[PDB]
Ligand binder design. Structure first.
Ligand SMILES: Cc1[nH]c(-c2cc(NS(C)(=O)=O)ccc2Oc2ccccc2)c2c1C(=O)CCC2
Length: 109
């Protein structure tokens, strides 16, 4: 059942948004604000920006064919972060902590 699969995907995303993970998850809640952050090269380096709010909208709208399409967007959000930033960046360590939460829940769904 794909209704079942996406209920699980919604629960995973809702947990990623929960207070327990907020110390490291907050930079991923919304699209990267390139203008406010002065990252004028970001839209040239990152061809497909992704964030948790965009993913939530797609889940609500039922735009993912399966859990695999949901997973690929979550992993695109993390890969954009690892691609754009130096490996020692504070945001990369935050992306890794959030990805630890996602990979465990997603594998056990
Ligand atoms: C280069 C970069 N900076 C930000 C960032 C986004 C916001 N708020 S926002 C969502 O844009 O509304 C605020 C501050 C930010 O910088 C940080 C965040 C934490 C630690 C150090 C710098 C992100 C980012 C990414 O690569 C992806 C994830 C978010």
């Amino acid at each position: 059942s794909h209704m079942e699969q996406l209920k699980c995907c919604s629960g995973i995303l809702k947990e990623m948004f929960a207070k327990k993970h907020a110390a490291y998850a907050w930079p991923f809640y919304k699209p990267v604000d390139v203008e406010a952050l002065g990252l004028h090269d970001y839209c040239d380096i990152i061809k497909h920006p992704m964030d948790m709010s965009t993913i939530k909208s797609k889940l609500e709208a039922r735009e993912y064919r399966d859990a695999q399409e949901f997973g690929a967007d979550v992993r695109l959000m993390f890969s954009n972060c690892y691609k754009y930033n130096p490996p020692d960046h504070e945001v990369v360590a935050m992306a890794r902590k959030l990805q630890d939460v996602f990979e465990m829940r997603f594998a056990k769904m």
